[PDB]
Amino acid sequence: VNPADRYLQHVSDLHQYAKYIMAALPKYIQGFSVWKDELTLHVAPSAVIPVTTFLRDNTSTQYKSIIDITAVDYPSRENRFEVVYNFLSVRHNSRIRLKTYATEVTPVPSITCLYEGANWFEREAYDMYGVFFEGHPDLRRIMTDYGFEGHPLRKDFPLTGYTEVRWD
Amino acid sequence: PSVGQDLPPVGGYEPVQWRRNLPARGFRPLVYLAALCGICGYGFYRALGGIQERRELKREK
Amino acid sequence: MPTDFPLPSQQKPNSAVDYTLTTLDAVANWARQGSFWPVTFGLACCAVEMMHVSAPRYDQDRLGIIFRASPRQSDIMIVAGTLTNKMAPVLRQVYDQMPEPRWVISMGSCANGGGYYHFSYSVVRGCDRIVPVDVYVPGCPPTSEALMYGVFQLQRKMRNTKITRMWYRK
Amino acid sequence: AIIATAFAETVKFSGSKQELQKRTLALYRQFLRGAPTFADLYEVQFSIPTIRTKIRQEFERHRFVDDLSIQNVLYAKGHMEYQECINFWKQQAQFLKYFPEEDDIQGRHQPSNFVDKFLKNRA
Amino acid sequence: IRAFTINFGPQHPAAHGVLRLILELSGEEIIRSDPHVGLLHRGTEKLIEYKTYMQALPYFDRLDYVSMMTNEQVFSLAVEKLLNVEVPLRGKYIRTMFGEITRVLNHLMSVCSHAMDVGALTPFLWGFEEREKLMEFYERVSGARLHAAYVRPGGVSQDLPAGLLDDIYMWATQFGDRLDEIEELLTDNRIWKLRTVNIGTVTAQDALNLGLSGPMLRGSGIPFDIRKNAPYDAYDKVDFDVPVGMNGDCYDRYLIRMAEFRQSLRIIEQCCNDMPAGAVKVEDFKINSPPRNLMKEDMEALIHHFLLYTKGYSVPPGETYTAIEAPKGEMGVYVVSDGSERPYKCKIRAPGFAHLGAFDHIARGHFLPDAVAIIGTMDLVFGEVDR
Amino acid sequence: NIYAGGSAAAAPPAGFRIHRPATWEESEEGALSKATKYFLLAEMFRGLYVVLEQFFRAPYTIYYPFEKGPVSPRFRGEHALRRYPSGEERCIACKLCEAICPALAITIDAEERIDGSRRTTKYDIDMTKCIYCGYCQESCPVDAIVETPNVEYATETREELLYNKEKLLANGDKWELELQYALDADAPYR
Amino acid sequence: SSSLYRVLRNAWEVGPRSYWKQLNSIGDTKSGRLVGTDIYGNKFYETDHQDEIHLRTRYVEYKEKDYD
Amino acid sequence: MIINIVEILIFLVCVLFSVAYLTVAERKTLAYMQRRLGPNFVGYYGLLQAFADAVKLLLKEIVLPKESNYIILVISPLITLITALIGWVVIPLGPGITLGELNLGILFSLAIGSLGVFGSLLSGWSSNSKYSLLGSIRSTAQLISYELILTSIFIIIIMFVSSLNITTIIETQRVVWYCIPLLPLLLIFFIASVAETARPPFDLTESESELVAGYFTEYSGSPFVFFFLAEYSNIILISAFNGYLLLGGYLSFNYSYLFNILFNDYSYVSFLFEGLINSSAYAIKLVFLMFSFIWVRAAFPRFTYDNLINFCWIILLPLLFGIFLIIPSTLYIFDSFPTL
Amino acid sequence: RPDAEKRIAAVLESFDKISNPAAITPTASFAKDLNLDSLDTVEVVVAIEEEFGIEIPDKEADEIKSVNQAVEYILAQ
Amino acid sequence: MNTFIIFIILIPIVGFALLAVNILLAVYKPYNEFNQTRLAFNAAFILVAILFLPFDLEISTLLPYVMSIYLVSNYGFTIVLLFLLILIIGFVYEINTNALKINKHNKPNTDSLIYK
Numbered sequence A: 001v002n003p004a005d006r007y008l009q010h011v012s013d014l015h016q017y018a019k020y021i022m023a024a025l026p027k028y029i030q031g032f033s034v035w036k037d038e039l040t041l042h043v044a045p046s047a048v049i050p051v052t053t054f055l056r057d058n059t060s061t062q063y064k065s066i067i068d069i070t071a072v073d074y075p076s077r078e079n080r081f082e083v084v085y086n087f088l089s090v091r092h093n094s095r096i097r098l099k100t101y102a103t104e105v106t107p108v109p110s111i112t113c114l115y116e117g118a119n120w121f122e123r124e125a126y127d128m129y130g131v132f133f134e135g136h137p138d139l140r141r142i143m144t145d146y147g148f149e150g151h152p153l154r155k156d157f158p159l160t161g162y163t164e165v166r167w168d
Numbered sequence B: 001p002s003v004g005q006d007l008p009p010v011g012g013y014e015p016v017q018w019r020r021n022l023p024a025r026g027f028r029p030l031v032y033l034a035a036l037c038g039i040c041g042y043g044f045y046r047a048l049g050g051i052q053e054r055r056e057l058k059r060e061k
Numbered sequence C: 001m002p003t004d005f006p007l008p009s010q011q012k013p014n015s016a017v018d019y020t021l022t023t024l025d026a027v028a029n030w031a032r033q034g035s036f037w038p039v040t041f042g043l044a045c046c047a048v049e050m051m052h053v054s055a056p057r058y059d060q061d062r063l064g065i066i067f068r069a070s071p072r073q074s075d076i077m078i079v080a081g082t083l084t085n086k087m088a089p090v091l092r093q094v095y096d097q098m099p100e101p102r103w104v105i106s107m108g109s110c111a112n113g114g115g116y117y118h119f120s121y122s123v124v125r126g127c128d129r130i131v132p133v134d135v136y137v138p139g140c141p142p143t144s145e146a147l148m149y150g151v152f153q154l155q156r157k158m159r160n161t162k163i164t165r166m167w168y169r170k
Numbered sequence D: 001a002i003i004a005t006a007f008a009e010t011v012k013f014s015g016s017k018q019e020l021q022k023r024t025l026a027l028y029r030q031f032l033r034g035a036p037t038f039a040d041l042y043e044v045q046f047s048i049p050t051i052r053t054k055i056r057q058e059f060e061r062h063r064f065v066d067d068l069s070i071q072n073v074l075y076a077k078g079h080m081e082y083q084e085c086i087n088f089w090k091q092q093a094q095f096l097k098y099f100p101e102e103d104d105i106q107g108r109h110q111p112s113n114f115v116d117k118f119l120k121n122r123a
Numbered sequence E: 001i002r003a004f005t006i007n008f009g010p011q012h013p014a015a016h017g018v019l020r021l022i023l024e025l026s027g028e029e030i031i032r033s034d035p036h037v038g039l040l041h042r043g044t045e046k047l048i049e050y051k052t053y054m055q056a057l058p059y060f061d062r063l064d065y066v067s068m069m070t071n072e073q074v075f076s077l078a079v080e081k082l083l084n085v086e087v088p089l090r091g092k093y094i095r096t097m098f099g100e101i102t103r104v105l106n107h108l109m110s111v112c113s114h115a116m117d118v119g120a121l122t123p124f125l126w127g128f129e130e131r132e133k134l135m136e137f138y139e140r141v142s143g144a145r146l147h148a149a150y151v152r153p154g155g156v157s158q159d160l161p162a163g164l165l166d167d168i169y170m171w172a173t174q175f176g177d178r179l180d181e182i183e184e185l186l187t188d189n190r191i192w193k194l195r196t197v198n199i200g201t202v203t204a205q206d207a208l209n210l211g212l213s214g215p216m217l218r219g220s221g222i223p224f225d226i227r228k229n230a231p232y233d234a235y236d237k238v239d240f241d242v243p244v245g246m247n248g249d250c251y252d253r254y255l256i257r258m259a260e261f262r263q264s265l266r267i268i269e270q271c272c273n274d275m276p277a278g279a280v281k282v283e284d285f286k287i288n289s290p291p292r293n294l295m296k297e298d299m300e301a302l303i304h305h306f307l308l309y310t311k312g313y314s315v316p317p318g319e320t321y322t323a324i325e326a327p328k329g330e331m332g333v334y335v336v337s338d339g340s341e342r343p344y345k346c347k348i349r350a351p352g353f354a355h356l357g358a359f360d361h362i363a364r365g366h367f368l369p370d371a372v373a374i375i376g377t378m379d380l381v382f383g384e385v386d387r
Numbered sequence F: 001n002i003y004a005g006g007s008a009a010a011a012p013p014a015g016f017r018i019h020r021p022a023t024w025e026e027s028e029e030g031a032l033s034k035a036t037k038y039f040l041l042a043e044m045f046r047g048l049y050v051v052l053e054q055f056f057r058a059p060y061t062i063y064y065p066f067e068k069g070p071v072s073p074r075f076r077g078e079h080a081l082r083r084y085p086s087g088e089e090r091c092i093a094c095k096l097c098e099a100i101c102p103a104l105a106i107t108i109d110a111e112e113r114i115d116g117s118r119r120t121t122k123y124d125i126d127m128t129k130c131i132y133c134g135y136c137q138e139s140c141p142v143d144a145i146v147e148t149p150n151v152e153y154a155t156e157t158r159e160e161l162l163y164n165k166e167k168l169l170a171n172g173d174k175w176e177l178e179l180q181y182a183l184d185a186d187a188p189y190r
Numbered sequence G: 001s002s003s004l005y006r007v008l009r010n011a012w013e014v015g016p017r018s019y020w021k022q023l024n025s026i027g028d029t030k031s032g033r034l035v036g037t038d039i040y041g042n043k044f045y046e047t048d049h050q051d052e053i054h055l056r057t058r059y060v061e062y063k064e065k066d067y068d
Numbered sequence H: 001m002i003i004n005i006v007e008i009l010i011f012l013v014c015v016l017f018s019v020a021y022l023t024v025a026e027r028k029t030l031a032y033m034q035r036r037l038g039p040n041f042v043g044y045y046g047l048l049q050a051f052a053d054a055v056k057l058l059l060k061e062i063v064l065p066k067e068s069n070y071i072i073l074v075i076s077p078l079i080t081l082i083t084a085l086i087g088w089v090v091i092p093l094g095p096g097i098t099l100g101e102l103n104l105g106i107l108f109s110l111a112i113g114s115l116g117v118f119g120s121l122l123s124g125w126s127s128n129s130k131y132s133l134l135g136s137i138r139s140t141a142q143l144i145s146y147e148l149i150l151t152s153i154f155i156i157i158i159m160f161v162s163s164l165n166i167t168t169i170i171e172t173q174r175v176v177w178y179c180i181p182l183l184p185l186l187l188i189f190f191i192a193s194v195a196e197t198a199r200p201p202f203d204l205t206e207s208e209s210e211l212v213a214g215y216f217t218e219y220s221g222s223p224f225v226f227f228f229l230a231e232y233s234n235i236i237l238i239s240a241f242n243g244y245l246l247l248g249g250y251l252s253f254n255y256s257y258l259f260n261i262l263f264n265d266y267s268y269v270s271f272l273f274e275g276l277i278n279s280s281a282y283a284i285k286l287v288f289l290m291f292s293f294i295w296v297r298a299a300f301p302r303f304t305y306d307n308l309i310n311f312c313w314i315i316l317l318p319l320l321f322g323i324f325l326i327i328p329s330t331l332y333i334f335d336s337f338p339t340l
Numbered sequence I: 001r002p003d004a005e006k007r008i009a010a011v012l013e014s015f016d017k018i019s020n021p022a023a024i025t026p027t028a029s030f031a032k033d034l035n036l037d038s039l040d041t042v043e044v045v046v047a048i049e050e051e052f053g054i055e056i057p058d059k060e061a062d063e064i065k066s067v068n069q070a071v072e073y074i075l076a077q
Numbered sequence J: 001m002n003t004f005i006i007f008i009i010l011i012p013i014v015g016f017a018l019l020a021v022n023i024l025l026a027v028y029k030p031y032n033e034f035n036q037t038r039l040a041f042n043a044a045f046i047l048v049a050i051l052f053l054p055f056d057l058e059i060s061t062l063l064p065y066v067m068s069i070y071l072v073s074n075y076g077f078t079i080v081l082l083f084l085l086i087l088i089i090g091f092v093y094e095i096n097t098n099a100l101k102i103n104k105h106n107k108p109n110t111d112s113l114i115y116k
């Protein structure tokens, strides 16, 4: 058997939800996509908070819980980095993924206004990329050398880095 | 095909023990209290009589 | 002075003074061998194996090893687990406040020459670059059998310490 | 994690070049005020005005950037390094990154002409 | 003006971890905390973009080095969901019950290590002993101990020995006595019950706002488990109760861990009775190796055996986030396929990452010895959190 | 029926409403009986009796230089290069072991020798970074490098730890017995 | 197990000269049967006895004082 | 002059030479309590290792922190050591056999245990780090707070004695022990006994996790053998107190019935055997008790300091005043008043 | 405060980038008369408060553009 | 000349023989090898020792009683029992005022969601 049939009835279900979401908030959703029951949402950079309230606050749509956020670069395109979010409706046993985009210069806002644990996550993907989170106390580096310069998960940045350590 | 790999017994295994094996051992707690007072009071009967004995020995000295 | 003199690896006791010094050396090295206090440095996949030596299959108390996790009471240090850029000054500082008859042993393959993270950016390419390590314990899960064997290797080195015989400057 | 640490601020992006300039001026005042704390804390070999003449020239390095928002990321990085040095978070090994040139006078035959580059084929 | 703020542990404060951890104490009461993690931070994610999925697999048993096999499992699951392949039946059960003996191992390490961190010395040895018995069971299947070069993204590395499935039953009968035995001096235990009755309360909606999961979220009262909510690997086909706590205390977070031994043993009883027969790897030779019997005989098996070990197998482009129930919590992984054979990017969601991130929302007001009982029941092994 | 919206079959289950917790007077036992367990420390002496029972039982530990723990045939420790019957080096430089050692511990140069067959000029493992994946064993068609289950080879210098071809052929000379024994239990399950 | 009776009876089985060597060699009293010896010269044993824990069965008696 | 300087040496090799093998014995116990083997590599059956501990420990250096007055770090090890060593006068060893008999026994026995806090409070002040100071505070507050109840039951013991001589108590105790009438007294005394020693059901204060690698000072060397040996002297010293004033001190049974069967007359053999059996009854009580300390050290986790002060002043000590109201009353019901 | 501006001149003289140390008048502009920069401004102001040990708020630090304003501020203590 | 006085004098010399044995036997004695503002307390640290003094002191107050208890038959009983019954209510002052409570400000926010 091809292991995609067991998804299909749900997957064709999920689309009806997803289109609904675009009909719900047409100001902020650039698009939706889904591939093997992973629902992915398409949000402008200055557009994050009004979506995430609705994803938290609706009774039909209550995700309540950040799971992990990070960034992925695509230096081929103009807006360089893109910022991805993952949630988990523990009532309705569902997941949702939210992608925005940001150039290294420009920000994305912080969802630390609502999601409390996310301030730690946003602290992470700062240092790995340089992608900001405006509106965020305790924005500083983590899980790298304190005096480190540059960003590790960046395709121009070399593998071994620049500086090595020895005891003089 | 499939040959030589390990398989379960055709009779299966015995069912294992996975519950809380916790017997409420010992006695009733009131038995511990009553035995406590018994050991005490017998000790006091040995104690105070010996003390009065020692006082009469003190008189004799 | 004699133009020929036996190497200290090759010398034998011949003076009665040397019998006295060698037996006294044996007592000092012997108390150093039996009582044996490392410090819990372990930090990563190379630290559970350090606890596996404390486990009741491959006991270390029967060897006299016990983890006084306080570096002033420690004889040696077991560098275990990987070693990052961010940590390494703390490693140097923990090496600093140790008493003088010390050693340090490199448990784990990341701890010598980087190991699996030899090409990372924020990593020290083995703890050679920080402390002078005398025995390496190879193995990426460096086996309890191998870790104990590293201790026995170090104890053989301890038997050949010659702290007393060098007062005669052999 | 409702609450921040001692000196950490919510990051916020000044809309004007002047407001950025005001923040940078206050920031250099913060470094310059906390500089004698650093020589105590990081136990450094040398003197306080050497710290001050580095902190001046590091902002002299970035005096001539045009953009608002590239100076915004630059200000945020400066504020984070202030946040590190005002606490014990950097250690003195990591603190002495900022003076490679001070601690050792370089060594014999620093190559200057073409020839000293050439005899060691540009090092 | 600020507290006389301390460094908690440079080296050996909490066993199995470098817990550098700023505390601001005002009455031996934490007004706020700030754990600096990064001390183990090897930067593994920068590496795993430069190696093939074939090679990229033992990055992850290094991650979360007390429960290797769930990390192995979750990356194999992410890639099997990405590749649109299906592991066979025998493979599903063998991966399932190894992912449950690893759960037995993980709680057996974590509860006993936490009891040592508190001060109870006897489970800290009685548990590691049975962990050595389980080191043996890792040893017969796969490589050495404590780092299994096992479940491949095609499924399973190789078959069992000829008699492990018997021998593990001889072990499994006596694990119940050896578990209730350590239960007998920690569960009632007025010292332990005093130290752990309401310490670090975690309410429901704040457990969700801190992104927590696994035994902690199930301790707060919400019945959520990936083994039964979004099932996989014949956890459907194996009957399995789940424990759910009542308060937000550390005592529910203790008692649920005690319960999951009793549950994961019942896993092994329903697995060893009903292990099927069939191919233990995936059916084809185009995502994992052919067996070495017939590659010395067949021309076709060689080129697969060569390309899988020079190039590796090619992955369709896309991205997945597969998260499963590690015994620490919900461990996730987010892989972004190039369409090449190196992963273009791969984030981990280490479970203890948000647990550490949710520390000073829980740890406010409590005492400094109370700031130890909170540590090892959010299970900061620190192999997870930085990486 | 029809659900509401914000409404799955995930309702709260039957009897999810927990009981009102019992007070001092909704308790079956007497206060004297409860406080007997309070003062006389029932569950203290209970666990004390547990550990006393474990005093009178057997230990587990072994005398390690005299007894060794369990060793699987698929255990892995240090390396060796096997040879053929009638003694030939068995390693061709397919470079698979270089290709899939995920720490790049393998380094090989190799040349066509006098007779024309391919052999390895320099074969070199960096045992600082041999991570015991064992993939290097599973990557040889001609089954030349193996996993010798020795672990007791602890060195004192990093210089000793760079196994070139000669040390590995010496290990293949040494452990040849045990590698035959191990492959007589693993070559089916490979 | 590790009772006094077992160590006493195995010491009475082996012989006090080999016992006095063995106590200076290991801490235990162990009575095997000479399954075989080494090309380096190392006498091995194997224990029949019923009161033995798992993997205490077989063991080495070395040759050199400076063993490992 | 000649026969007393040997009288003190034999007591030294009876006690100081024994307290080392106590520290070997604790490892042997906790081995079999946690199902492993004790030290076996070191000696013949793995004995003697405390010598290998000490001789190594005497060979390490005298590294000293810069914040510590070095004289203070000489005084506190020495005075804690000699406090727990001059507590060894009026242990009784048979009838009236002490080092120096004096009619005020308990007062010395208790004032030197009262001096026992004074070293550990003084010790944490050297190397004046804030954690290092406040750890000494947290240690000394419990170390006085149970020193109360340790002191405070010694008077209700001698509400059966009314005499401060220690060896008078055992001859009073011939008719019956004191533990077997007064059973919960033993339980609260046993927890009070492990309180004044640094034992980890109760010693939270040796938390290396809380401090910056601090147990007390990490002061090591031949300094380290001093507080260490003082600690293990304190162990069996409070065991000795438990031995005489609560348990059968040197008494086993009547044993005159046996003697008139054996001997026909007094002789040095008869004194030898009777002193043997009295010392052996004292020994067997003392040796079961040192085992019991480990037997409770194994099975329990440590405390919170809040738990520790709550454990002193709220749950134990009003029950102690209840004892102070019931035992003079029980004395008052019958005539029963003890005379010297 | 008498001779306070003498101490202010003593602190101000110790710098560089001053084409005339005798241009230290009580009405010396920082940017104009002393030929200073925006960074030199808070440099000399922090040097002043360090000379006295007093601490100053931000806006009152920001607005001191001449040594006349420094001697205007100086009697806050 | 009595061994009692020999015992308390010899042991400091034994401690000196253990003290200077390191100074004889060691080598390499001493190589090269923020605390700005705060200290923190509750009353539960400072009060235990200060309150400890009358409760330690009353033991030495009660100590001359227990030696002479046969002489004071049925009446020194009455006096000392009055003394104790003063001190015991002196004790139960503090336990009702909770003088050793070191209570935590980790309150779960009792006040509900009063809205609009």
Ligand code: SF4
Residues within 6 Å of the ligand: C044, C045, C046, C080, C081, C082, C107, C108, C109, C110, C111, C115, C116, C139, C140, C141, C142, E062, F131
């Ligand atoms: S030796 Fe192995 S387990 Fe340990 S740090 Fe290195 S890679 Fe990790």
Ligand code: SF4
Residues within 6 Å of the ligand: F100, F101, F102, F103, F104, F105, F106, F125, F129, F130, F131, F132, F133, F134, F135, F136, F137
């Ligand atoms: S087991 Fe050794 S040879 Fe094989 S891939 Fe790993 S490091 Fe390389």
Ligand code: SF4
Residues within 6 Å of the ligand: F090, F091, F092, F093, F094, F095, F096, F097, F098, F108, F136, F139, F140, F141, F142, F143, F144, F145
């Ligand atoms: S051992 Fe195998 S992989 Fe390595 S060079 Fe030889 S044939 Fe190639």
